Amino acid sequence: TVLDRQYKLLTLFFHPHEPIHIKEQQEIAASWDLEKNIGLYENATAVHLTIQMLHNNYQVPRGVPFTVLESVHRFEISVYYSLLYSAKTYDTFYKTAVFLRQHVNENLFVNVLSVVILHRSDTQDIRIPPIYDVFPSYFHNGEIMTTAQRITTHGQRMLEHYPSTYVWENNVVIRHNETAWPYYCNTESMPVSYFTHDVTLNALYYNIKLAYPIWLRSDACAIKEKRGELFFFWNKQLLARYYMERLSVGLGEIPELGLNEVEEGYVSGLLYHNGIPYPVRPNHLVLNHQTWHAEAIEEIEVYENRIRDMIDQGFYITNTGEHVSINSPDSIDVLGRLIEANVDSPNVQYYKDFISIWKKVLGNSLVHESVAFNGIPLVVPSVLEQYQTALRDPAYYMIMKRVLKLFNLWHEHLPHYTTKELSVPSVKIEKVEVDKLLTYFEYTNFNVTNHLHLNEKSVLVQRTRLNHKVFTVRVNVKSGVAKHVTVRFFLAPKYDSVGNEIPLNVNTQNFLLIDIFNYELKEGDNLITRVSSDNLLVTDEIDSASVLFNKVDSALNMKQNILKTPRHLLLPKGRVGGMPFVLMVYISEYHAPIDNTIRLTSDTLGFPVDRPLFPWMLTGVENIFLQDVQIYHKPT
């Protein structure tokens, strides 16, 4: 019965903005009544709250932007999640989903239903469609969407007048985004536009926040996920990759964010479904004038000073006034939880969310204090207030760099690793060599037909993306005696924006983990010959909505999880003629430990680059090797 259930849940994601077209779903929406069917829900309080909200009309109006950073939106989405998750039977769950689809905003319903499907036992096999297919308007420029609407409604008669559009195959018409948006931010935004505007990266951020919502309290499974450590590690990896891209395109180090003025602005060029332009941050934005920006920055400074005091003093304050030490090396998780100010933080009243205030300030979304129903505020969020568009703005990377400065301060106070924790007896690496590192640009097609308001075709968008050829890394190692070992590869830049070789201690923060795997080392001489195509950290493209629908309706793979980095974004572009980089191979013992499942050997994720490392403490540690490589770009 998997196929039919998946088909129905897909039909729930066919046209969010438009109303229900399938008749029996209308019958269910008109027939079901929560009041009399309270007995089928475990959480009766959620049922009462939902009934009250739906009766008083105290809900976010339909056809309006939705943001989780607003309090009332969080309350509404949490209540709906509690109601949906408390469904005893799958039938009750589906019937509540239909009713909410009828009586709930599109974005909120999609998000809550996806979260419920991911975290429900009865729906551990259902596959949810990609976000960039349900709402294409968050990943393509407004001109593209308007042209799509025109070419569709024209009946493809004036389409042949358009030279940009073309018919690649029957029933599909494709455009070019190569020639468009001549007006753009420029500054530091254009050279890295092939990485920051990538659809897959924003989709990955959205899916990550689907797996770990800020408004959802962890269960036994989510309590072993080490939420804070994942936050820190993922932010570090993203910032290291972004810095590598900037060095590749010659833009320099990530600008440091102050408290007086921000020089770089952002113009999104995106449009909401209704047609409201996004807020724009001007260049040379002033933060020390008579504006709400000043008050927001003062609150941000207070909260960050509280975090700094907690880090330095070595303990945090409970909600009653007790001191809880965080000086042990295993307190990184609670530190991250406190910094994030999620619902799992011990004390959110004193440790508040300054990152959201940073996002509000640097989004320059004019607060007009407008409310509907004498209730829910009406907000026009900027790109930074949406996880599916935040990564397009450099300000996000600047803010995360500040948070990573806080994290580095905390890690600095920790004792440095010893020659016993960081050494494996009688394992010496001889030589490490990669076959080649080449990158090239290629074309890809995305389906944006779900935005078209069909009455009674399939428009696609062509985009340019980076990719790399398969590469093999071969290392020879002395093994001493037989062992079961783990090998980790790290990649870092070798020269900074000016030309001086970066010391290893500084590079410790710029090392990007690209592969980790097990091996059984024999006695004597060995050979590791890892191929990039075998790594499980990076995955291939997930099947599109159309492909999944075809494979389902016509009637598995475990190499496509929503919480993995796309393969084509693993390797930096480099330069034509070669760009130098540093590879680091580290071998350690194997210390023995589907929607949201990731686990490796029990140890800090960034080991051994989480703490600062110095050359003088690597003498006597032979199982770590630092080689130099060159990354090339194939021009086309």
Ligand X SMILES: *[C@@H]1O[C@H](CO)[C@@H](O[C@@H]2O[C@H](CO)[C@@H](O[C@@H]3O[C@H](CO[C@H]4O[C@H](CO[C@H]5O[C@H](CO)[C@@H](O)[C@H](O)[C@@H]5O)[C@@H](O)[C@H](O[C@H]5O[C@H](CO)[C@@H](O)[C@H](O)[C@@H]5O)[C@@H]4O)[C@@H](O)[C@H](O[C@H]4O[C@H](CO)[C@@H](O)[C@H](O)[C@@H]4O[C@H]4O[C@H](CO)[C@@H](O)[C@H](O)[C@@H]4O[C@H]4O[C@H](CO)[C@@H](O)[C@H](O)[C@@H]4O)[C@@H]3O)[C@H](O)[C@H]2NC(C)=O)[C@H](O)[C@H]1NC(C)=O
Ligand Y SMILES: *[C@@H]1O[C@H](CO)[C@@H](O[C@@H]2O[C@H](CO)[C@@H](O)[C@H](O)[C@H]2NC(C)=O)[C@H](O)[C@H]1NC(C)=O
Number of residues that bind ligand Y (CB under 6 A): 12
208 binds, among a second copy, ligand X, ligand Y, none (CB under 5 to 8 A by kind): none
DSSP-derived secondary structure letter, 61: P
Q: Are 591 and 599 in contact (CB under 8 A)?
A: no
513: its two tokens: 């983990």
Whose structure tokens read 């990731």?
A: 598
Nearest 5°: the CA angle 141, 144, 148 is 145
289 binds Cu ion (CB under 5 A): yes
Question: Using CB under 6 A, which of 187, 193, 458, 467 touches ligand Y?
Answer: 458
Question: Using CB under 6 A, which of 9, 60, 79, 210 touches ligand X?
Answer: 79
CB of 305 to ligand X, least distance (A): 20
CB of 136 to Cu ion, least distance (A): 5
| Strand pairing class (459-468; 512-521) | unpaired
137 binds, among ligand Y, Cu ion, ligand X, none (CB under 5 to 8 A by kind): Cu ion
Q: Name the segment binding ligand Y (CB under 6 A); options: 76-84, 279-287, 398-406, 542-550.
A: 542-550
CB of 30 to a second copy, least distance (A): 38
User: For residue 522, which amino acid is it?
Assistant: K
State how far Cα 107 lies from the chain centre.
Answer: 17
Rounded CA separation 536/132 (Å):
23
135 binds, among Cu ion, a second copy, ligand Y, none (CB under 5 to 8 A by kind): Cu ion
CB of 407 to ligand X, least distance (A): 21
143 binds, among a second copy, ligand Y, Cu ion, none (CB under 5 to 8 A by kind): a second copy
255 binds ligand X (CB under 6 A): no
Question: Using CB under 8 A, which of 503, 518, 534, 550 touches a second copy?
Answer: 503
Please name the residue ranges forming H helices in 419-544: 504-507
257: its two tokens: 């964010």
User: For residue 133, which amino acid is it?
Assistant: D
460 binds, among a second copy, ligand X, ligand Y, none (CB under 5 to 8 A by kind): ligand Y
Identify which of residues 158 and 221 has a Cβ nearer to ligand X in the complex: 221
Q: Are 569 and 241 in contact (CB under 8 A)?
A: yes
CB of 107 to Cu ion, least distance (A): 10
Letters for 285-324 (x = contact with a second copy by CB under 8 A, - = none) are: xx--x-x---------------------------------
112 binds ligand X (CB under 6 A): no
Identify which of residues 364 and 510 has a Cβ nearer to a second copy in the complex: 364
Residues 6+ apart with CB under 8 A from 160: none
Query: Strand runs (DSSP E) across 202-345, as ranges?
Result: 261-262, 285-286, 315-317, 323-325
CB of 252 to a second copy, least distance (A): 13
Rounded CA separation 125/113 (Å):
15
Report the half-sphere exposure of 33 (CA within 13 A, side-chain side). Answer: 3
283 binds a second copy (CB under 8 A): yes
Segment 61-80, which members bind Cu ion (CB under 5 A)?
A: none
Question: Using CB under 6 A, which of 449, 486, 526, 604 touches ligand Y?
Answer: 449
| Strand pairing class (261-262; 285-286) | antiparallel
| Strand pairing class (565-566; 538-539) | parallel
Letters for 587-626 (x = contact with a second copy by CB under 8 A, - = none) are: ---------------------------xxx----------
Residues 6+ apart with CB under 8 A from 322: none
112: its two tokens: 């809550």
Segment 35-54, which members bind ligand X (CB under 6 A)?
A: 43, 45-46, 49
DSSP-derived secondary structure letter, 451: T
Q: What are phi and psi of 99, to 5 degrees?
A: -60, -45
Rounded CA separation 85/122 (Å):
11
Rounded CA separation 350/504 (Å):
37
Query: Strand runs (DSSP E) across 345-482, as ranges?
Result: 428-434, 438-447, 459-468, 472-478
Letters for 504-543 (x = contact with a second copy by CB under 8 A, - = none) are: x-x-------------------------------------
355: its two tokens: 């990152």
Q: Are 421 and 603 in contact (CB under 8 A)?
A: no
Question: Using CB under 6 A, which of 29, 40, 172, 348 touches ligand X?
Answer: 348
546 binds ligand Y (CB under 6 A): yes
CB of 440 to ligand Y, least distance (A): 24
Segment 461-500, which members bind ligand Y (CB under 6 A)?
A: none
Report the interface residues with ligand X, using CB under 6 A: 43, 45-46, 49, 78-79, 82, 318-320, 343, 345-349
Report the interface residues with a second copy, using CB under 8 A: 141-143, 145-147, 182-184, 186, 190-191, 267, 269, 271, 274-278, 280, 282-286, 289, 291, 364, 366, 368-371, 373-375, 378, 380, 498-500, 503-504, 506, 575-578, 614-616
